[PDB]
Amino acid sequence: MATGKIVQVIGAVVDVEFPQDAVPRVYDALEVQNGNERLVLEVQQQLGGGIVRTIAMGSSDGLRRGLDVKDLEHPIEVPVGKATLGRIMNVLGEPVDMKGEIGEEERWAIHRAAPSYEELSNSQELLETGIKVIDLMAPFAKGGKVGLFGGAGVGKTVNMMELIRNIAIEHSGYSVFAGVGERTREGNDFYHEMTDSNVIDKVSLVYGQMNEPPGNRLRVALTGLTMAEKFRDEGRDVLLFVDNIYRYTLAGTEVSALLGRMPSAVGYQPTLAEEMGVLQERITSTKTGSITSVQAVYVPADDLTDPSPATTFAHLDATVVLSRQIASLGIYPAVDPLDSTSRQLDPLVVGQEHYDTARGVQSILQRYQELKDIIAILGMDELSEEDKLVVARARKIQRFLSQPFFVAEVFTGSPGKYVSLKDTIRGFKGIMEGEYDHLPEQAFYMVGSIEEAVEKAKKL
Amino acid sequence: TGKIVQVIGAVVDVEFPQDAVPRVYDALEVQNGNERLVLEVQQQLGGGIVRTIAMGSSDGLRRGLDVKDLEHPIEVPVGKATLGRIMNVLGEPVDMKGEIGEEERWAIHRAAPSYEELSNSQELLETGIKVIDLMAPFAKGGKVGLFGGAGVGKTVNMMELIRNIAIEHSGYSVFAGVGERTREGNDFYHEMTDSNVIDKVSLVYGQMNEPPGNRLRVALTGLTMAEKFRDEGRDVLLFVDNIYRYTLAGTEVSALLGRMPSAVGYQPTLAEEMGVLQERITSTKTGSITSVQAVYVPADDLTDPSPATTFAHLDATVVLSRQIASLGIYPAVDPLDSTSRQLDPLVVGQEHYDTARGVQSILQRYQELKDIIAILGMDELSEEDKLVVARARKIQRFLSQPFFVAEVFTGSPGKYVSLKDTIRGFKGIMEGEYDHLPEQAFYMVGSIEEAVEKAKKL
Amino acid sequence: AQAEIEAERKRAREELRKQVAILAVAGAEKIIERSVDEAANSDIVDKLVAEL
Amino acid sequence: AQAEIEAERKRAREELRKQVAILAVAGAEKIIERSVDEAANSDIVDKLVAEL
Amino acid sequence: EFITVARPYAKAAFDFAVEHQSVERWQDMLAFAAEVTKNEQMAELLSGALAPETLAESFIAVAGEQLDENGQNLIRVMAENGRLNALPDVLEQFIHLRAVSEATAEVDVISAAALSEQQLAKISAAMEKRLSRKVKLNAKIDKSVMAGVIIRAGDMVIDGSVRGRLERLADVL
Amino acid sequence: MQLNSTEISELIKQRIAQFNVVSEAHNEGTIVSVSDGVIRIHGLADAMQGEMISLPGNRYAIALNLERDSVGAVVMGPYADLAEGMKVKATGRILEVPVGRGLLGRVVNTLGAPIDGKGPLDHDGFSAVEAIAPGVIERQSVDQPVQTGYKAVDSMIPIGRGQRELIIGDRQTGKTALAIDAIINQRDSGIKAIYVAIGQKASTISNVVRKLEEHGALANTIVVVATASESAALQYLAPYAGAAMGEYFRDRGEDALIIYDDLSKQAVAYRQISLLLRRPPGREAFPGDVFYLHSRLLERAARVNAEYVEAFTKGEVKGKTGSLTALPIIETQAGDVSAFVPTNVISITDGQIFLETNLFNAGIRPAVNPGISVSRVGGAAQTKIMKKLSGGIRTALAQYRELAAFSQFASDLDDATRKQLDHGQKVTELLKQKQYAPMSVAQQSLVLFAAERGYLADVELSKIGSFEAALLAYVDRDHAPLMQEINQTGGYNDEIEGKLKGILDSFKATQSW
Amino acid sequence: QLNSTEISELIKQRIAQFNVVSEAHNEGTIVSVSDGVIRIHGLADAMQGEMISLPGNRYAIALNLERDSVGAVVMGPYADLAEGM
Numbered sequence A: 001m002a003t004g005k006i007v008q009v010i011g012a013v014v015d016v017e018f019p020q021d022a023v024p025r026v027y028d029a030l031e032v033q034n035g036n037e038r039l040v041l042e043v044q045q046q047l048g049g050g051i052v053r054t055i056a057m058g059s060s061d062g063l064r065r066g067l068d069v070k071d072l073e074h075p076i077e078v079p080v081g082k083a084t085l086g087r088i089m090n091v092l093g094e095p096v097d098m099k100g101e102i103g104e105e106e107r108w109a110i111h112r113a114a115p116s117y118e119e120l121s122n123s124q125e126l127l128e129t130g131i132k133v134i135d136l137m138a139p140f141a142k143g144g145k146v147g148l149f150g151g152a153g154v155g156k157t158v159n160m161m162e163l164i165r166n167i168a169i170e171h172s173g174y175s176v177f178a179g180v181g182e183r184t185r186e187g188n189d190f191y192h193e194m195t196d197s198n199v200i201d202k203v204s205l206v207y208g209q210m211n212e213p214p215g216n217r218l219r220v221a222l223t224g225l226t227m228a229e230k231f232r233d234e235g236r237d238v239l240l241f242v243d244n245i246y247r248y249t250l251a252g253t254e255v256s257a258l259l260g261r262m263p264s265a266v267g268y269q270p271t272l273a274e275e276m277g278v279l280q281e282r283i284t285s286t287k288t289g290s291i292t293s294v295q296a297v298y299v300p301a302d303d304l305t306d307p308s309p310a311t312t313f314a315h316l317d318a319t320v321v322l323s324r325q326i327a328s329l330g331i332y333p334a335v336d337p338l339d340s341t342s343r344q345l346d347p348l349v350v351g352q353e354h355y356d357t358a359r360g361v362q363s364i365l366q367r368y369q370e371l372k373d374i375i376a377i378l379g380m381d382e383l384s385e386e387d388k389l390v391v392a393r394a395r396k397i398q399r400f401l402s403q404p405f406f407v408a409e410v411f412t413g414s415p416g417k418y419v420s421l422k423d424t425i426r427g428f429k430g431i432m433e434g435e436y437d438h439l440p441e442q443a444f445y446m447v448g449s450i451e452e453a454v455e456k457a458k459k460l
Numbered sequence B: 001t002g003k004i005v006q007v008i009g010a011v012v013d014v015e016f017p018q019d020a021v022p023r024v025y026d027a028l029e030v031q032n033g034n035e036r037l038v039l040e041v042q043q044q045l046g047g048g049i050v051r052t053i054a055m056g057s058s059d060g061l062r063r064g065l066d067v068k069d070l071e072h073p074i075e076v077p078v079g080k081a082t083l084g085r086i087m088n089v090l091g092e093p094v095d096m097k098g099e100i101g102e103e104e105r106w107a108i109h110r111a112a113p114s115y116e117e118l119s120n121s122q123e124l125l126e127t128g129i130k131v132i133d134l135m136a137p138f139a140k141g142g143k144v145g146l147f148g149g150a151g152v153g154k155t156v157n158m159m160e161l162i163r164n165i166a167i168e169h170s171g172y173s174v175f176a177g178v179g180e181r182t183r184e185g186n187d188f189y190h191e192m193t194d195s196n197v198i199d200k201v202s203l204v205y206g207q208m209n210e211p212p213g214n215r216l217r218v219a220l221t222g223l224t225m226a227e228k229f230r231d232e233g234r235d236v237l238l239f240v241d242n243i244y245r246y247t248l249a250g251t252e253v254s255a256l257l258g259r260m261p262s263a264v265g266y267q268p269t270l271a272e273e274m275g276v277l278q279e280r281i282t283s284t285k286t287g288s289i290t291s292v293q294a295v296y297v298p299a300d301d302l303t304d305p306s307p308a309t310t311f312a313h314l315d316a317t318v319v320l321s322r323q324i325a326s327l328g329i330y331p332a333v334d335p336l337d338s339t340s341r342q343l344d345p346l347v348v349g350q351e352h353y354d355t356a357r358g359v360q361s362i363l364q365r366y367q368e369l370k371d372i373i374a375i376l377g378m379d380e381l382s383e384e385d386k387l388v389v390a391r392a393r394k395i396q397r398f399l400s401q402p403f404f405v406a407e408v409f410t411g412s413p414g415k416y417v418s419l420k421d422t423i424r425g426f427k428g429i430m431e432g433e434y435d436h437l438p439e440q441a442f443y444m445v446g447s448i449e450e451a452v453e454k455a456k457k458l
Numbered sequence C, D: 001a002q003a004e005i006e007a008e009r010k011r012a013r014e015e016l017r018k019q020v021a022i023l024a025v026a027g028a029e030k031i032i033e034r035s036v037d038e039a040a041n042s043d044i045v046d047k048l049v050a051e052l
Numbered sequence E: 001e002f003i004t005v006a007r008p009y010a011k012a013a014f015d016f017a018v019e020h021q022s023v024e025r026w027q028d029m030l031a032f033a034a035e036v037t038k039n040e041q042m043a044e045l046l047s048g049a050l051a052p053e054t055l056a057e058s059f060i061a062v063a064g065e066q067l068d069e070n071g072q073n074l075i076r077v078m079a080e081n082g083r084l085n086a087l088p089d090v091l092e093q094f095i096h097l098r099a100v101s102e103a104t105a106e107v108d109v110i111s112a113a114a115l116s117e118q119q120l121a122k123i124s125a126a127m128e129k130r131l132s133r134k135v136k137l138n139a140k141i142d143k144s145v146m147a148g149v150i151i152r153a154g155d156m157v158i159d160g161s162v163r164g165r166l167e168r169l170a171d172v173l
Numbered sequence F: 001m002q003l004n005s006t007e008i009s010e011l012i013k014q015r016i017a018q019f020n021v022v023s024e025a026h027n028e029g030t031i032v033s034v035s036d037g038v039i040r041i042h043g044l045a046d047a048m049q050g051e052m053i054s055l056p057g058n059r060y061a062i063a064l065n066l067e068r069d070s071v072g073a074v075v076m077g078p079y080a081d082l083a084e085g086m087k088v089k090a091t092g093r094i095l096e097v098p099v100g101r102g103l104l105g106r107v108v109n110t111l112g113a114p115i116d117g118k119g120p121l122d123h124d125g126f127s128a129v130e131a132i133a134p135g136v137i138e139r140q141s142v143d144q145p146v147q148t149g150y151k152a153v154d155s156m157i158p159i160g161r162g163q164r165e166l167i168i169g170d171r172q173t174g175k176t177a178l179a180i181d182a183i184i185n186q187r188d189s190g191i192k193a194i195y196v197a198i199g200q201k202a203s204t205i206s207n208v209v210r211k212l213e214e215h216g217a218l219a220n221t222i223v224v225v226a227t228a229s230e231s232a233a234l235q236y237l238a239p240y241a242g243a244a245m246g247e248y249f250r251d252r253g254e255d256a257l258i259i260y261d262d263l264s265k266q267a268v269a270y271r272q273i274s275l276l277l278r279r280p281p282g283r284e285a286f287p288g289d290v291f292y293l294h295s296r297l298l299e300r301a302a303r304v305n306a307e308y309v310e311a312f313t314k315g316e317v318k319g320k321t322g323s324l325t326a327l328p329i330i331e332t333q334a335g336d337v338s339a340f341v342p343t344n345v346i347s348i349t350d351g352q353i354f355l356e357t358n359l360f361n362a363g364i365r366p367a368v369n370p371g372i373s374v375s376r377v378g379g380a381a382q383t384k385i386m387k388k389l390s391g392g393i394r395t396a397l398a399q400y401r402e403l404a405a406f407s408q409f410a411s412d413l414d415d416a417t418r419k420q421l422d423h424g425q426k427v428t429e430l431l432k433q434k435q436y437a438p439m440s441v442a443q444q445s446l447v448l449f450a451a452e453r454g455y456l457a458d459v460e461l462s463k464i465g466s467f468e469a470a471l472l473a474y475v476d477r478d479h480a481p482l483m484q485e486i487n488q489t490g491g492y493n494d495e496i497e498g499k500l501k502g503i504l505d506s507f508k509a510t511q512s513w
Numbered sequence G: 001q002l003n004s005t006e007i008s009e010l011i012k013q014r015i016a017q018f019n020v021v022s023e024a025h026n027e028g029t030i031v032s033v034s035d036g037v038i039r040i041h042g043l044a045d046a047m048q049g050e051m052i053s054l055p056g057n058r059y060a061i062a063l064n065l066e067r068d069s070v071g072a073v074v075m076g077p078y079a080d081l082a083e084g085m
């Protein structure tokens, strides 16, 4: 029987009054008929007597004051396990690929506590990406968390596509893709990319697109985490890709004002750090299984000061910062070496060879960033000859960090390149010393290995 | 019939029997001591309460005063009976002459003309000012806006536009003083009467001393008179003394009306309040209104919401810069920000368009060089960059001009310049015909002949 | 063309004066649901010519 | 110009529709109020309470 | 208006009156508590800054009829929260709750004439069929109705009038 | 003419015959307050959110706040005549607009009532103003061109059929000019056009419609208007009415191009509505759900696969993919992209075109900044000839600007740097283009072939413009069959390169600039 | 005009016997749960910074002593708490 009644509808937030002895628990699901369509509500707050404030998992349009609401005595539960592979699902775990019923054996609540302190692991096995700047400057480890920071239009999506192509096909294990707040076009293109390359059988996709109401976006990320946690607790090693962590926080901001909370900072909800931590602390590798995750992070107006990116910085292990200052020059991947960093970049993992190479590159680029200001007004003739040589070799290293990517074939009209870590280290050593002092700057731009930059120089 | 129940600043709440509640924008009336006060209805609250703005000083009002419900909005005299007379927001005569011989009264709240009625026109209207009709020329029946901060010459420029246009033009004119200096209204009134041009001009004055309701509604009063002359089929000139004061008088009352603040504390209705006023100032297939408006820019912030909203509503925009004015270049027009719908090769023709874009390009390049010049000095520049600077400085000086209303300030006779002389002069400067004259030769000269005659005596 | 259509306009007004009476009676009978042989056609014709 | 005149034609037609309809129902109000009958009023009630 | 803050008290009072089988007395008591609220001098006192308990005891002093320890305590509760001016709206919601509980509806019928009373028998039967409640009629004659009748029940209306039908057809431009 | 008015008088007589006498039943409320276009209604227990509420006269309101004991609603029209105690009836209806092919060449308001005065509409029924976009499985990848006719945009920033491309910049930088040129160029491409005007002054709309009428574009275009005089509820809905009209073509295998003008003024009207309804302000005083507003507006523009079209048309149309392309316009105050509305719209769209004042004053018009401008869909949107040539242009030009900055005080210039700087200046000069002068595919391809094969290299810079004009005239008179081949196919081959090489060699020898 | 803990069954309790102070000051009931904060009715002897014991061997710190209720912050998982505890 249905036992509650809608008493307000303001925007996406619905208030329901139940009898005072059967009030729904927090995060319980509720059900109502919005005409023909069934609608689900998630309980956020218990307030007053018998009244609960809820977020609609769907459009509020057509709701009336007075509609009977059924009390489902569980939170939102989603299908998990092998049945999800090759399927596209919405936030509620319903198929949206037309292929038919999921056919699950088990369903899990999307709300659950993080692993306890005793369960964590520190198995920092190095992982190669095949990308120059990432493998040198910000080396991955299996089971770690990676963040691709950047404002709009800097390369987060194609970088994540390149990483998917390289590791995810080679991984030999299941993968979960959470399209949090994603463009619908891009989800379609990714689905057909995975189907045509015939790897879709190993991946399960959860999509909450931009057009959907705030609740769907707010909880789709937790649905994806729940599937990844199901595969982890089996003992498998899984890859988790998140389209954009920022839009989860933004949906929280949308609902927060209507949930009666006073605002804080730059419009953000007061609970920003709590919500971020509660999501992020579930994405970890335990002693039973490992989750490796790549997360794209929107940076509003490239202001890395803004509370959402500034807050997410603390939760990651490797952080790659994509800068529009570099992207304006068209030199993709546009990774900033002076801002990107990783926990794995110390000699006890990387070895002294790799550590020394990376620190040398960082020092050279920092020095050049200082010299460039002198040049801009006083002119390069005013420098020391040592500083002139440093400027030259730094301006070469800057272009050598560029790499043509497979996935960007359409954009660059040229074939993409893959490079090993050993060859990358040798190339940067070669530029730091004299071996290539004589090549022009343009001979390095979007080349590939150092062994073919000489070839572009001969062509230039 | 009504009872006053609250008085908060300019806002008065009145209770009426629930079967008789006044409509929105109805005029109410209350006796305040030894005088009559009009209130205009803004909102209907619940339970027969109605919220109104006082068209006068609200001090001395008690609660519990009996209020009379007039059955109509504020209605003002219109037509030729208003010509040559000074009137208040309520349409009352404010000059010491007798009553206005009205034949008809119009409600000041009206709808804008329909899309079907609007008319296009491309007739360029000449002005005596070099920079305005070079950089931002405007047509008969269009809108012109003068944007500027405090004390940069909006009024002086508008007075030159009056002198030239509204005296070579033959039809009627309406001048609306909105929240500006009373001294300037009296000065304008007299110099109109001394010139015996007053009998072509209707003047409505809502100056700063007035309480907020008057400054709020006086602009609509002026528009109502201008619409009467337009609908008669005439060609009319409308001058608005400061449009910004209308939005500011909205801001002052908005909080007392119980409306949440927006943006920089503006009323949430800012765009609609400005739009409904601005859309009524339009030329029509029956008759044409030409409009010049001063637009005050608070704290010189051209990105403030009020100037920003005003920019979309105008056909020609002239932006006055304090930084130029402090050089003493008058009129202080910024040619890199001033712009017009009419600067288009089809309407102006190719020579004018090419000259304007050349001037614009050289001045932009000079802006690009000034940051180099500030640190290094000019000696580091290239020999072509030095020529760009040498010509840009002369262009900046040649945009200056003596005004007749500025005869009292400068002490030197005013100048009227034909458009052909402007195009010829700037084309000559950019082509380098005058590269041998000093900069001082170009400052405050009417025409290029006067520049060469000044150059002979340096 | 404006002059042409104005002449036809006054002609059409003369024609429609009759038709509007059929609107009056048909609307009265449809609105009152059943039919009614009302007598006082003076009111019909008074409106019919007066406002037109 | 010619297509303009054929647009103006429709603009002329619609206004006449509007005029005749409004003035006809203005006449019909007079006609119907003057033609009220108690049996017809009772038949309106007997209709609506039969469907209600 | 006080409706939203009056609802909780109205429910509590009706529930209590149901338990103690005193609904009728409570109605006649709330009528008096609402009527004292309307008096001039008492209204001035209610708008004052008296501490809750002093106001409550003065009000209870004027409200002598009130059943001690039940209605007077309701006054004390409302005086803690300063809702006494809501009493005209704490009443009438009590009446609404009573009418719902008694499954009874006032329904209104407006016509160009005094209806034939046989028509009213049919109308009352029809309303007791449309709504599963006993229906009290308090019909009216109205000049605005050209002919026919308007039936109004709660916030539902069934327009059978000639006026409404005309202005419904005149809409068909 | 007017005898046909007697015939339509018979039509009025038959209105009575078609009318229905049955008494309906409806839910009722009373207006309890009126202020600034917002009304509070007591009653209406059965009102739904987003429902049309009907007022005295022929006026409507949209129910937005369904609070306890009151409904808050916004009036879609002049509100000042409404009064407290007026009865109000709740319909069952959501808002719908007329839609169909007859709308083309008409100017209509946000409710779809014609305002051009060209008589009543012809239309194919009504469609809901608020509607959900096609899901992931129902879309198809964007891989067809929509030609702008501008060298800069079509070369550097290609727009595909189904893309959302933001036009962003400060005031008076050419934002509207670009969009109406994009409309004008569709006069013969088969793509239908919709121009939505939010908050503009009506005479500006009349002028833009006049320009559309001087060219051949008006017959292919729907103009939807909500002027600055109209209520904030008639604004803020106009984009959705335009979107419904675009969707009619999208869901029948036809292409539509919709230009939302000043999405920012939609945001401003929505802020007015939200503050008058006392909803809590967020950042910069906008409500929090403004992102949801713009995102659900812009996610409707999509390319749908043939299966969805067949299902929608019930088999009447088979094998055809429909597309709706959106070109929203945003105004920045001082190039400040960090404002709330610009950040949201930049997050949503598939790219942006930055127009900026420094380039415009320098005479670079259209003032497209090659560095901060981008198109996510990419060469997939271009024809093969334009793809092949244009790939190099935009990144080469951006690095040209960097190199010029670094060079500004270097006196010795190495030959590689000198080549880059000279080429960058000549390409920068080449992309300037006059208003209302769109260029076909063959013309753009020819001029880019002149640039990328170095035929410009020796040509002195001011003469580059006359070089382009003379080359177009020469090729139009002498080599038109190749222009037809390129415009129709868009193909590119070794014989195409050879024929273009021969044409450039022959022009540069025989002709004069 | 808005409600401040004016809920039907508490009001009915007071109507029956206004002097509910007869019940012990030591205890109270949860009347709201949201975002880790709970509002408690009762606890007349609560004091600033006092530990309040919750079911499940949990605690909350009393931070707002208000004229009708105590606002307390839960020192652990809170999502299972319910009004009437």
Ligand SMILES: Nc1ncnc2c1ncn2[C@@H]1O[C@H](COP(=O)(O)OP(=O)(O)OP(=O)(O)O)[C@@H](O)[C@H]1O
Binding pocket: B148, B149, B150, B151, B152, B153, B154, B155, B156, B157, B296, B330, B331, B403, B406, B409, B410
């Ligand atoms: N053309 C001019 N020649 C010389 N001086 C001028 C000229 N225009 C303005 N000024 C100087 O600027 C002063 C202020 O001018 P004006 O009153 O027109 O400014 P405004 O911008 O309209 O000011 P406000 O905002 O205070 O009304 C004049 O009194 C005069 O000293």
Ligand SMILES: Nc1ncnc2c1ncn2[C@@H]1O[C@H](COP(=O)(O)OP(=O)(O)OP(=O)(O)O)[C@@H](O)[C@H]1O
Binding pocket: B312, B340, B341, B343, B344, F170, F171, F172, F173, F174, F175, F176, F177, F178, F331, F365, F366, F433, F434, F435
């Ligand atoms: N390609 C071009 N070449 C030359 N002039 C141009 C070009 N494009 C636009 N213009 C001119 O620039 C001016 C402003 O153009 P437009 O109205 O399109 O700008 P906008 O950014 O949309 O303006 P607003 O903020 O007023 O709506 C006009 O005078 C127009 O003629």
Ligand SMILES: Nc1ncnc2c1ncn2[C@@H]1O[C@H](COP(=O)(O)OP(=O)(O)O)[C@@H](O)[C@H]1O
Binding pocket: A150, A151, A152, A153, A154, A155, A156, A157, A158, A159, A332, A333, A404, A405, A408, A411, A412, F374, F375, F376, F377, F378
């Ligand atoms: N490695 C690359 N090669 C070529 N183009 C790139 C590369 N990285 C980014 N881009 C350019 O950047 C555009 C947008 O990048 P994308 O990752 O889709 O943006 P966002 O980071 O906002 O998701 C691409 O369409 C392309 O034009």
Ligand SMILES: [Mg+2]
Binding pocket: A155, A156, A157, A158, A296
């Ligand atoms: Mg990305």
Ligand SMILES: [Mg+2]
Binding pocket: B153, B154, B155, B156
């Ligand atoms: Mg002044």
Ligand SMILES: [Mg+2]
Binding pocket: F175, F176, F177
């Ligand atoms: Mg524009």
